[PDB]
Amino acid sequence: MNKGELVDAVAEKASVTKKQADAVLTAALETIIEAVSSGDKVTLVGFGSFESRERKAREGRNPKTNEKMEIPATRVPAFSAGKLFREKVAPP
Amino acid sequence: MNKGELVDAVAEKASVTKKQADAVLTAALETIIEAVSSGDKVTLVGFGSFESRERKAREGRNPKTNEKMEIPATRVPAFSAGKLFREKVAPP
DNA sequence: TGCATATCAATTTGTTGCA
DNA sequence: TGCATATCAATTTGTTGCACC
């Protein structure tokens, strides 16, 4: 399933337009990204949360030259699936 | 941020109602979960993808009885943030 | 796209049960 | 959500760069 297909399915459950539902899902996706980047945790009860996570510098290795090197510290977006989501993927 | 706060923020950006936007956002979240469960990979352009992943059985330990135990094989929801999301979180 | 080094290396998650 | 076990043990991603695996 892609964005479009999702938009289609959604328009139906809530009852709006393709243009509409698209506009709204987008608003949410861009807002999620913004919040996480700006250091906020996005929480969505049952579905899961999004957060940015710090990553320390770590040593890696050049597969070409075989030299040791340092992978600099970074920040990554992270997701944690909420309970309802986990339990639909793996029914207890 | 929470669903509600996301709802409030979303209603504005795309131009809808709070009861409306919510119902929409909800639709999408249920559908994502439903899709991922049935083995459907959800790929949203300019955000990331959701999929279900196999996990083999693995070793654990009962913190009560301190007995070694086997955690059964399962499936878990996984999120794969796209390039845009990653670059916003961590400018290149 | 996928896949590859390193006898990697920093990281995530789960295990019970109750608060 | 948290705590509290293992001198845990699977998991993930990335290092640079080809067209394999």
Q: Which residues touch strand D (CB under 7 A)?
A: A 58, 60-64, 69, 71; B 53-56, 58-63, 66, 78, 80, 86
For tokens 């094989």, what's the residue? B73
Which tokens is A1 given? Answer: 């399933």
In terms of CATH architecture, what is A1-92? Irregular (4.10)
Residues 6+ away with beta carbon under 8 Å from B49: B41, B42, B43, B79, B80, B82
| Sign of the torsion formed by the C-alpha atoms of A21, A28, A48 and B32 | positive
**B41 secondary structure, DSSP code:** P
**Residue A73 φ/ψ region, left for φ over 0, alpha for ψ in the -120 to 50 degree band, beta for the rest:** beta
Residues B64, B66, B71: CA angle, nearest 5 degrees: 90
Q: Is the distance from CB of A86 to CB of B55 less than 8 angstroms? A: no
Which of B17, B34, B57 lies closest to A15 in space, CA to CA? B17
Backbone φ, ψ for residue A46 (5° rounding): 95, -40
Q: What is the DSSP string of chain A?
A: -BHHHHHHHHIIIII--HHHHHHHHHHHHHHHHHHHHTTPPEEETTTEEEEEEEE--EEEE-TTT--EEEE--EEEEEEEE-HHHHHHHS--
* Tally of CB atoms within 10 A around B6: 21
**Way it was determined:** X-ray
Q: Across the strands, what pairs with B70? A: B59
* Tally of CB atoms within 10 A around A56: 8
Residue type, B32: I
Q: Is the distance from CB of A91 to CB of A76 less than 8 angstroms? A: no
C-alpha span between B2 and A78 (Å, rounded): 16
Backbone φ, ψ for residue B60 (5° rounding): -140, -175
> Is residue A3 less than 8 Å (CB to CB) from chain B?
yes
C-alpha span between B21 and B10 (Å, rounded): 7
Go through chain B and tell me how many residues it has.
92
Which tokens is B16 given? Answer: 């809808």
Half-sphere exposure of A66 (CA within 13 A, CB side): 0
C-alpha span between A28 and A34 (Å, rounded): 10
Q: Is the distance from CB of B72 to CB of B57 less than 8 angstroms? A: yes
Contact B10 A28 (CB under 8 A): yes
